[PDB]
Design a protein around this ligand. Sequence first.
Ligand SMILES: CC(=O)SCCNC(=O)CCNC(=O)[C@H](O)C(C)(C)COP(=O)(O)OP(=O)(O)OC[C@H]1O[C@@H](n2cnc3c(N)ncnc32)[C@H](O)[C@@H]1OP(=O)(O)O
Ligand SMILES: NC[C@@H]1O[C@H](O[C@H]2[C@@H](O)[C@H](O[C@@H]3[C@@H](O)[C@H](N)C[C@H](N)[C@H]3O[C@H]3O[C@H](CO)[C@@H](O)[C@H](O)[C@H]3N)O[C@@H]2CO)[C@H](N)[C@@H](O)[C@@H]1O
Ligand SMILES: [Ca+2]
Ligand SMILES: [Ca+2]
Length: 177
Amino acid sequence: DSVTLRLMTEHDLAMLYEWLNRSHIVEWWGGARPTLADVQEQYLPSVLAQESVTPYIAMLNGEPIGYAQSYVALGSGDGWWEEETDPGVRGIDQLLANASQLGKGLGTKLVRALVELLFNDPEVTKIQTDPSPSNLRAIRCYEKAGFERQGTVTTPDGPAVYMVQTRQAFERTRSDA
Ligand SMILES: CC(=O)SCCNC(=O)CCNC(=O)[C@H](O)C(C)(C)COP(=O)(O)OP(=O)(O)OC[C@H]1O[C@@H](n2cnc3c(N)ncnc32)[C@H](O)[C@@H]1OP(=O)(O)O
Ligand SMILES: NC[C@@H]1O[C@H](O[C@H]2[C@@H](O)[C@H](O[C@@H]3[C@@H](O)[C@H](N)C[C@H](N)[C@H]3O[C@H]3O[C@H](CO)[C@@H](O)[C@H](O)[C@H]3N)O[C@@H]2CO)[C@H](N)[C@@H](O)[C@@H]1O
Ligand SMILES: [Ca+2]
Ligand SMILES: [Ca+2]
């Protein structure tokens, strides 16, 4: 059915810890097999706020099915998005909790939901994402969700395929009119 997003709370941290240690997630996220204390210290919504990151839980049929986050690119940690000048740019990262639910279009639905959420903030001008060049499945998911590959950028987490979706693009693709 429909994928929706809710803010993540401190009550979700134990569940997130479990997720972040699932093998299909470890492959792409972290580098990193975080301990419970790691997840508690780093993903606490108030702590994430210090790097302009907002955490979400993705929901499907009343069940938590994934984690996502958005961030203000201009507000990111040292080394991150240092050429950015537009405070309207938001980036996203996300994961699906269940190995059995990968590759079935659920991630595309999640990304679409997150993109819509973000453009409902009228200050937001463009959404970006930075999948690993190795992560072809994530790249194709973002493409299906309306992102376009720009090129390769150097990040603190290595080279990334920089992908964007502008507000004008989102407007244009809302209808075939
Ligand atoms: C910036 C970031 O957050 S980067 C990545 C983040 N997180 C992760 O990788 C965690 C582990 N993976 C996941 O959570 C999920 O796979 C997600 C969220 C990345 C993607 O969601 P999914 O539901 O798996 O993707 P979805 O099924 O919507 O689309 C994936 C597409 O990739 C395609 N694909 C998979 N592998 C490849 C490949 N090697 N080459 C080309 N295409 C591929 C699939 O065929 C599908 O495209 P299609 O509809 O044209 O057939
Ligand atoms: N990883 C250790 C911790 O990272 C924290 O940083 C938090 C975020 O700022 C950081 O997220 C960065 C984001 O900042 C940056 N602007 C974009 C980058 N892709 C994100 O990276 C995140 O998502 C990708 C998936 O796309 C994962 O592969 C990666 O391991 C994960 N950290 O990941 C952490 C969870 O959101 C703090 N710097 C600190 O507590 C500590 O260094
Ligand atoms: Ca405002
Ligand atoms: Ca149109």
